[PDB]
Design a protein around this ligand. Structure first.
Ligand SMILES: [Mg+2]
Ligand SMILES: [Mg+2]
Ligand SMILES: [Mg+2]
Ligand SMILES: [Mg+2]
Ligand SMILES: [Mg+2]
Ligand SMILES: [Mg+2]
Ligand SMILES: [Mg+2]
Ligand SMILES: [Mg+2]
Ligand SMILES: [Mg+2]
Ligand SMILES: [Mg+2]
Ligand SMILES: [Mg+2]
Ligand SMILES: [Mg+2]
Ligand SMILES: [Mg+2]
Ligand SMILES: [Mg+2]
Ligand SMILES: [Mg+2]
Ligand SMILES: [Mg+2]
Ligand SMILES: [Mg+2]
Ligand SMILES: [Mg+2]
Ligand SMILES: [Mg+2]
Ligand SMILES: [Mg+2]
Ligand SMILES: [Mg+2]
Ligand SMILES: [Mg+2]
Ligand SMILES: [Mg+2]
Ligand SMILES: [Mg+2]
Ligand SMILES: [Mg+2]
Ligand SMILES: [Mg+2]
Ligand SMILES: [Mg+2]
Ligand SMILES: [Mg+2]
Ligand SMILES: [Mg+2]
Ligand SMILES: [Mg+2]
Lengths: 182, 158, 319, 102, 76, 120
RNA sequence: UAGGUAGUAGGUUUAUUAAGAGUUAAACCUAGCCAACGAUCCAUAAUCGAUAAUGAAAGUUAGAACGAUCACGUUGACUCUGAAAUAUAGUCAAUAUCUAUAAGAUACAGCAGUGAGGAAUAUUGGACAAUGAUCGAAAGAUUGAUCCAGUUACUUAUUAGGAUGAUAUAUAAAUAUAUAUAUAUAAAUUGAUUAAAAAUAAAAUCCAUAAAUAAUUAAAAUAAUGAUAUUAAUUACCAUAUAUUUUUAUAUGGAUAUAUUUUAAUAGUCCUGACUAAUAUUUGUGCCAGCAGUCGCGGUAACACAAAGAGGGCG
């Protein structure tokens, strides 16, 4: 697993899979990937940078190249003409990184049981998750349709909850509150 | 890996399975008649014709297929203990029981194998009949004259 | 022609100027501060609109282009605010007519650059309870419930299982006040599913796209032959898509017309056990030429594609 | 579990230990002359008491034999030969013939 | 350019090139020869591996150390 | 065991995790060499069981894939199984007590429940 | 390497092995066969896969590892025994060593090791506990087969923390719910004076942990016997229990003038002129020192040579 080094950097401006404030500002100030005045190789490299920074930043590219599946999946609607109106184009290529959402960590992140995929992996490793009633400690566990997975309420609360201040910090805020009330 | 596709994308090799019955059984009168059927003697001839001398010291005609009988095979291989004995001894008891079980398994195996071969030939014939009927049905179905053919130009007298 | 370029905001913002030498600030940091607004003693940014969470079932997603880098509004009156030369907040001189009216699709779209991604609709507890009762107490088939509410059969069966778990937690009082607060918050944070609303209803005619169909084939026939889906399916040696979808409807675990009797053809012999034994052999019929670990099988243990599995206890194993 | 009673050939732990053979005498202190310990201790306890691998396996095998009434005695360990194993016998026999029998 | 005429263990004599800032190769020195030609020199077809045999690594080399047989300064 | 045709086990798998293969092989050949026929698999490691289901009464299970008919034929034509194969086959029911030995006498030990066949 | 082959190409006989043919041995007759779609010769080489690498594929490559098939166990020939040896047996020769100086013994390509040749390739471990083999009526005995462990990042695969985080101090008492808390005084590393950053990066706070501990006494194996062996989880006390895939709630028992005890992860290596991802700028050198896969850099003036700051890959 890649060590977390400069994930929330403002200069590089890469959107990560986290609820962090700095990631929020990166997502805010980014105005899309600029493919103007770039050759094909440069366009591909920029796209790879961005898409990998978001999807599966913690997988060595050697492993991601094996996990990558060249076959994309799609579903066809049989009542397209019957319903009527205009028909939209299927975004096939958005399924490029669809092989990663069957993992347990990404499952937790999507279910909003953790603030980030990294925290989901830590939860799994420390052993606060179960799949079909089995304590799974391996983030790379791949789910199947119909499976069920659960997380400890305390860990989910910590992920989707504010930080618990230290005693001295809380005293400082309470002193300020006292002054305001008076 | 590249070659595993020809065999079902399964890696490795099993030992070649060997037949319980090494020779065609006598009850397969189908294949008996097939072998006794007249032998071609022409462009696709299988043997010598009239008026040609086979090489000195050679058998002109091919050997005879050794058709075997399941009952005869069982009789020659496994024989009942025609002489009954007083099995008072422990080793005698054990060995008699073992022989009983082995004989039962062997005879069951031969009988079931013969039944399987007979069923196989019958099922193959039935499948062939079904496929012939399907062929005729499809051919006549395509032969049925559809009105939509009139929109194709035809130089029939031509 | 490419070069490294810091990811400066596209929208205008007050950049640095002459800074006291011992400040060592960056334009990125000043943009961060302008976006977040002042930090209060509580460690909170009340000015930023995205700081809190909505409670009106309307997702609150970023609208950079629509807002043009103006994330600061008044916490209580929800009026826009903007930075002034003197450095304090103040309503913009001219109102922004883009923000006054947003389309529903953009309201649900989370990321500006991606129009395809859209948030999903949260089912009301009333609807979950109704579906539970209709599937268990009333015995209505999963296909019937899916047709009634517009939901997909996997989703309805999933909600049945989930509500079973919820009921167990209720019997054992496991649910707590904090979990209830999360429930309410994230229920108010998302829109509700309305079965009466067709545009809300999901589609129930989606089938997987097979490889044989993915390829394009072209047939030349005279200008009067009728040609329909049945003929196309016959040419592709596939069953009609209607047959494919009907099978999907019946495939459901608890859906109607389920059959898995094939295994019933094989023989199993559970061997006997005596006092003191620790296990019990379960023999099973097998077929020569199709059983046993193969000889010469590829050893992938030292290659990049070595197989990995997990046993019933969840333990990692090499399969 | 079940503790068989002693016999005249094996009145006690010393008798059993002497009779089993294979230089098991030094285990006197380890077993302390406790028949119940002899028939209640397994390889785990024997290992923590410090007996050798061969010693513990042999002792347990003969204990099982006695518990099942099978004969107790010392059985052959197995030697190579006076003239040495097969792979050296030819050379050793030549040397022995030459040096002793000339 | 600094180069050397070296006899390999196989018996063939070749001309190799010594890279880096300064070298300590002398007559009858045991060195290791690898492939690679000095483009500007016609005839030379090999390099000598700095940091191997009796040929020491480049002195005070802090960039691309591995390519020149330099050990990391701990400074700790 | 004696005889030049024997029914035995050949090991497969990985270190510290074996899985045997019940085969008919010449006594002359190597343990893991290609046999006359491969009859089945056998996983010595029992299926794991949870504490709650132990107190329920569930017992661990050992999978032994096998082809009864060809095992019958091979033990009928004279193949001699190795002791472990004999224990497996007898316990299944292919063999009977005539293959038992005085060293292993479980007839006198109480039985929990007898063997049974199922069309799973 | 352009002509080769004289048992050579047929026919014949009678020996010969269970059996065939110039396959050996005889006779014995005919001239005949192989050849520029490459004979005969000469070099090189152990073949192959449902094995490994690669490619879209036909293919090309390897033949280490997993399995099949040959040929050997210092080199050459020959003979017993047998249904099958030119046997890792004998017999006599070649070498190259030993000690019994003799119809002498031995050739590690079995295991572990030692020299040497190499750029380069391990332990003179443990056990027969498991699966097999050999002897035995059994009891059992022997197995460097085999199963384990030891060296080696040679190759894979796992984990090797993650939420929050841009600074400190000082302001009128002289509960029915406030909230945009304001003023201030100081401090502020390396660059730099603005799209020029290093940088949420550090420290700090909050939670976690396979961290001496603390019972499993699982499984490999049962009638028994475990080398591996200090072998997997839940707890800071264990278990029947009201809870049947469910940290689990009942101060149940000894010790306590509610917790006193937790402990914890710190990356290297290439490159930034173009092919080829890397604009934040400086120092030194000055066709020299030196880079370089290709085009090509270096003459005081280097985006390429050695640095520093930033930066891009792989890990
Ligand atoms: Mg570039
Ligand atoms: Mg050149
Ligand atoms: Mg280096
Ligand atoms: Mg025997
Ligand atoms: Mg093991
Ligand atoms: Mg010849
Ligand atoms: Mg002849
Ligand atoms: Mg002659
Ligand atoms: Mg030639
Ligand atoms: Mg050779
Ligand atoms: Mg090949
Ligand atoms: Mg090989
Ligand atoms: Mg080859
Ligand atoms: Mg090898
Ligand atoms: Mg030989
Ligand atoms: Mg040698
Ligand atoms: Mg030889
Ligand atoms: Mg010899
Ligand atoms: Mg060796
Ligand atoms: Mg050397
Ligand atoms: Mg190596
Ligand atoms: Mg040994
Ligand atoms: Mg790795
Ligand atoms: Mg400065
Ligand atoms: Mg034990
Ligand atoms: Mg360089
Ligand atoms: Mg040029
Ligand atoms: Mg360069
Ligand atoms: Mg440089
Ligand atoms: Mg640097």
């Amino acid at each position: 697993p890649r060590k977390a080094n400069l994930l929330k950097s403002l200069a590089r401006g890469r959107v990560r899979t986290s609820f962090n404030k700095y990631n929020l500002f990166n997502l805010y100030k980014k105005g899309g990937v600029d493919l103007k005045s770039k050759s094909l190789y440069q366009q591909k490299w920029t796209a790879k940078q961005e898409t990998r920074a978001y999807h599966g930043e913690h997988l060595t590219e050697k492993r991601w190249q094996t996990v990558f599946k060249p076959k994309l999946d799609s579903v066809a609607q049989l009542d397209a003409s019957l319903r009527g109106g205009e028909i939209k184009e299927t975004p096939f290529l958005l399924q490029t990184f669809a092989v990663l959402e069957k993992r347990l960590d990404f499952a937790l992140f999507r279910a909003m049981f953790a603030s980030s995929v990294r925290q989901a992996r830590q939860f799994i490793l420390h052993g606060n998750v179960r799949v079909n009633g089995v304590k799974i400690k391996h983030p790379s566990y791949t789910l199947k349709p119909g499976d069920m997975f659960s997380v400890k309420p305390d860990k989910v609360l910590e992920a989707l909850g504010a930080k618990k201040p230290s005693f001295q910090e809380a005293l400082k805020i309470d002193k300020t509150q006292i002054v305001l009330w008076n | 890996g590249k070659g595993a596709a020809k065999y079902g994308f399964k890696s490795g090799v099993f030992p070649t399975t060997r037949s319980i019955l090494k020779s065609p059984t006598t009850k397969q009168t189908d294949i008996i008649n097939k072998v006794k059927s007249p032998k071609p003697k022409g462009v696709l001839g299988i043997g010598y014709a009239k008026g040609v001398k086979h090489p000195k010291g050679s058998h002109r005609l091919s050997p005879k297929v050794n058709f075997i009988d399941v009952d005869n095979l069982i009789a020659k291989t496994v024989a009942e203990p025609q002489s009954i004995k007083s099995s008072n001894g422990s080793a005698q008891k054990v060995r008699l029981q073992k022989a009983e079980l082995r004989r039962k398994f062997l005879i069951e195996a031969f009988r079931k194998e013969e039944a399987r071969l007979l069923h196989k030939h019958e099922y193959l014939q039935k499948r062939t009949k079904e496929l012939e009927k399907a062929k005729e049905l499809e051919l006549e179905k395509l032969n049925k004259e559809k009105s939509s053919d009139l929109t194709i130009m035809t130089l029939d007298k031509m | 022609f490419s070069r490294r370029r810091i990811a400066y905001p596209f929208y205008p913002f007050k950049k640095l100027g002459r800074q006291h030498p011992k400040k060592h600030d960056t334009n990125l940091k000043t943009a961060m501060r302008q976006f977040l607004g002042p930090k209060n003693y509580k460690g909170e940014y009340v000015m930023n609109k995205y700081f809190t969470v909505p409670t009106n079932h309307v997702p609150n997603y970023i609208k950079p282009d629509l807002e043009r880098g103006q994330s600061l509004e008044h916490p209580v009156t929800k009026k826009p605010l903007q930075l002034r030369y003197d450095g304090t907040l103040g309503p913009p001189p001219v109102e922004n007519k883009r923000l006054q009216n947003i389309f529903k699709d953009r309201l649900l779209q989370p990321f500006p650059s991606n129009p395809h991604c859209k948030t999903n609709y949260v089912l009301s507890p009333q609807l979950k309870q109704s579906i539970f009762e209709e599937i268990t107490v009333e015995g209505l088939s999963a296909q019937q419930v899916s047709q009634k509410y517009g939901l997909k059969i996997p989703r309805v069966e999933a909600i049945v299982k989930l509500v079973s778990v919820e009921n167990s937690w209720n019997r054992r009082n496991r649910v707590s006040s904090d979990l209830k607060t999360m429930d309410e918050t994230l229920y108010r944070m998302f829109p509700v599913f309305d079965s009466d609303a067709s545009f809300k209803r999901e589609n129930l005619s989606e089938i997987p796209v097979p490889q044989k169909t993915l390829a394009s084939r072209f047939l030349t026939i005279a200008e009067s032959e009728p040609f329909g889906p049945v003929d196309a399916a016959h040419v592709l040696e596939l069953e009609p898509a209607v047959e494919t979808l009907r099978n999907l409807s019946t495939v459901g675990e608890h859906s109607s017309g389920h059959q898995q009797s094939t295994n019933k053809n094989t023989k199993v012999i559970y061997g006997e056990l005596v006092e003191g034994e620790r296990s019990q052999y379960k023999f099973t019929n097998a077929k020569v030429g199709k059983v046993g670990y193969r000889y010469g099988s590829g050893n992938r243990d030292n290659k990049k594609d070595r197989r990995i599995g997990f046993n019933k206890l969840g333990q990692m194993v090499y399969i | 579990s079940t503790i068989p009673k002693p016999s005249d050939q094996v009145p006690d732990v010393d008798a059993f230990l002497n009779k089993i053979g294979r230089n098991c005498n030094e285990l006197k202190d380890t077993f302390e002359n406790n028949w119940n310990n002899l028939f209640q201790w397994d390889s785990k306890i024997l290992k923590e008491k410090g007996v050798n691998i061969q010693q513990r396996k042999y002792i347990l095998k003969q204990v099982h034999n006695y518990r099942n009434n099978r004969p107790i005695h010392e059985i052959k360990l197995g030697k190579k030969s006076f003239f040495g194993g097969e792979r050296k016998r030819k050379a050793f026999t030549a040397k022995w013939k030459a040096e002793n029998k000339q | 350019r600094k180069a050397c005429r070296v006899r390999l263990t196989n018996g063939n004599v070749v001309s190799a090139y010594i890279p880096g800032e300064g070298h300590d190769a002398q007559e009858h020195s045991i060195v290791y020869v690898r492939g690679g030609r000095c483009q500007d020199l016609p005839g030379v077809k090999y390099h000598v591996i700095r940091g191997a045999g009796d040929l020491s690594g480049v002195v005070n080399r802090i960039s691309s150390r591995s390519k020149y047989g330099a050990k990391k300064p701990s400074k700790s | 065991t004696c005889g030049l045709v024997r029914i035995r086990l050949a090991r497969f798998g990985r270190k510290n995790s074996p899985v045997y293969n019940i085969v008919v092989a010449n006594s002359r050949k190597a343990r893991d060499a290609k046999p006359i026929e491969v009859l089945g698999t056998y996983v010595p490691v029992p299926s794991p069981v949870t504490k709650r289901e132990l107190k329920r009464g569930v017992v661990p299970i050992k999978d032994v894939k096998l082809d009864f008919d060809r095992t019958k034929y091979w033990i009928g034509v004279g193949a001699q199984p190795s002791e472990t194969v004999t224990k497996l086959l007898r316990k299944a029911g292919i063999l009977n007590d005539a293959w038992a030995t005085s060293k292993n006498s479980n007839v006198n030990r109480k039985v929990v429940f007898e063997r049974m066949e199922t069309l799973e």
